[PDB]
Design a protein around this ligand. Structure first.
Ligand SMILES: [Mg+2]
Ligand SMILES: [Mg+2]
Ligand SMILES: [Mg+2]
Ligand SMILES: [Mg+2]
Length: 49
RNA sequence: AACCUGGUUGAUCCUGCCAGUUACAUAUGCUUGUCUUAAAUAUUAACCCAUGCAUGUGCCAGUUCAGUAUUGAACAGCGAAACU
């Protein structure tokens, strides 16, 4: 539900594994623009200050 | 260098012009060893056009699940595309 804290969503995302044309094995994942971090929170108080 | 000289007569003195004389612009002829400097399709068509180039751009700080590198388990180096 909404009330759900960030950290929940951080580790609840998805990752992808693949073998490269280079015979390599990497693990990749995306950033989540919209994630409610403390930084976003800090800034808002700062602004109203 | 605030200069002028030849030509109208058989001689002469005049107006007066043609001519010479001078500078400077493009043209052009002939001739060209250095160094410094340098204009350059404007005039005749603001006429026509092959071809190549003449305008692009990214950071620490708008979006990277491209790719690299086995890299803070959300994402942290470099770093194209593409939306901005
Ligand atoms: Mg007479
Ligand atoms: Mg005579
Ligand atoms: Mg007479
Ligand atoms: Mg004259």
């Amino acid at each position: 539900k909404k009330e759900d804290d960030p950290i929940l969503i951080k580790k609840s995302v998805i990752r992808r594994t693949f073998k490269t044309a280079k015979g390599k094995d990497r693990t990749k994942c995306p950033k989540i623009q919209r994630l409610i971090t403390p930084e976003r929170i800090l800034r808002k108080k700062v602004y109203k200050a």
